[PDB]
Amino acid sequence: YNNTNQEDLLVLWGIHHPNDAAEQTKLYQNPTTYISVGTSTLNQRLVPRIATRSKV
Amino acid sequence: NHFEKIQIIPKSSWSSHEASLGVSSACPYQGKSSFFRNVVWLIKKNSTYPTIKRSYNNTNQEDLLVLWGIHHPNDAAEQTKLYQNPTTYISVGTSTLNQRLVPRIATRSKVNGQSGRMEFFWTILKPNDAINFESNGNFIAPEYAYKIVKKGDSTIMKSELEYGNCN
Numbered sequence: 001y002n003n004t005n006q007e008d009l010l011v012l013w014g015i016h017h018p019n020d021a022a023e024q025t026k027l028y029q030n031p032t033t034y035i036s037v038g039t040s041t042l043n044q045r046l047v048p049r050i051a052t053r054s055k056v
Numbered sequence: 057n058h059f060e061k062i063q064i065i066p067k068s069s070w071s072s073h074e075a076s077l078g079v080s081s082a083c084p085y086q087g088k089s090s091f092f093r094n095v096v097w098l099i100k101k102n103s104t105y106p107t108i109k110r111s112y113n114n115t116n117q118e119d120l121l122v123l124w125g126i127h128h129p130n131d132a133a134e135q136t137k138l139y140q141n142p143t144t145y146i147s148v149g150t151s152t153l154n155q156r157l158v159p160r161i162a163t164r165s166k167v168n169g170q171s172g173r174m175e176f177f178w179t180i181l182k183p184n185d186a187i188n189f190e191s192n193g194n195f196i197a198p199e200y201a202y203k204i205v206k207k208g209d210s211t212i213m214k215s216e217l218e219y220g221n222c223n
């Protein structure tokens with residue numbers, strides 16, 4: 001997405017950290033995943049973390 | 057102003073790993089290799105290191121300070137000698153924590169005789185929450201944690217003096 005406006009833009013996105021490998025496959029198929037994000041300054045590469053967590 | 061140190065995972069309960077081989081000349085005690093007392097340096101058993109999955113539920117009314125660690129070895133050969141598995145992690149979760157540690161190999165200067173490093177982590181586990189550990193190697197596991205039983209004014213004072221037997 002190119003910011004064609006004159007104003008700065010606040011952009012939000014996220015990553016899902018699932019519960020176990022089986023859920024990973026059920027939702028996304030691919031077992032080993034990433035999200036890379038770049039702008040003129042940002043250079044991000046996120047990876048989901050599996051952990052066993054308390055329900056909230 | 058006061059802990060009660062409590063056992064949360066007995067050292068005797070590691071039925072698939074070695075729990076009494078994690079000692080080092082870096083940590084001498086009375087002329088023998090030893091190690092930090094409140095955590096346990098787990099070592100593979102019979103050339104295997106099965107995946108650990110252990111939980112602890114804080115059934116107390118008080119917050120609990122929990123400590124654990126990861127070992128960063130010197131090279132691939134040491135990695136295999138201690139843990140068998142070449143590619144390892146420790147995942148830790150609570151209601152707020154979402155951690156996944158990975159050992160870092162680097163070639164490091166010897167300090168206290170060792171080029172390996174131990175990196176320690178901590179969290180406060182609230183009443184009725186649980187902490188879940190998972191690892192297939194390099195895990196320095198809790199044995200003792202600290203229940204916070206008195207809170208109040210205190211400070212850490214920097215001084216070279218010692219006790220003066222006064223009030």
Ligand SMILES: *[C@@H]1O[C@H](CO)[C@@H](O[C@@H]2O[C@H](CO)[C@@H](O)[C@H](O)[C@H]2NC(C)=O)[C@H](O)[C@H]1NC(C)=O
Pocket residue numbers: 054055113114115184185186
């Ligand atoms: C830690 O243990 C307590 C059980 O002693 C869990 O709290 C209970 O949750 C169950 C539902 O499965 C309820 O039926 C009980 O009434 C609860 N007891 C209390 C004291 O709240 C608690 O869920 C555990 N924590 C986690 C994150 O698993």
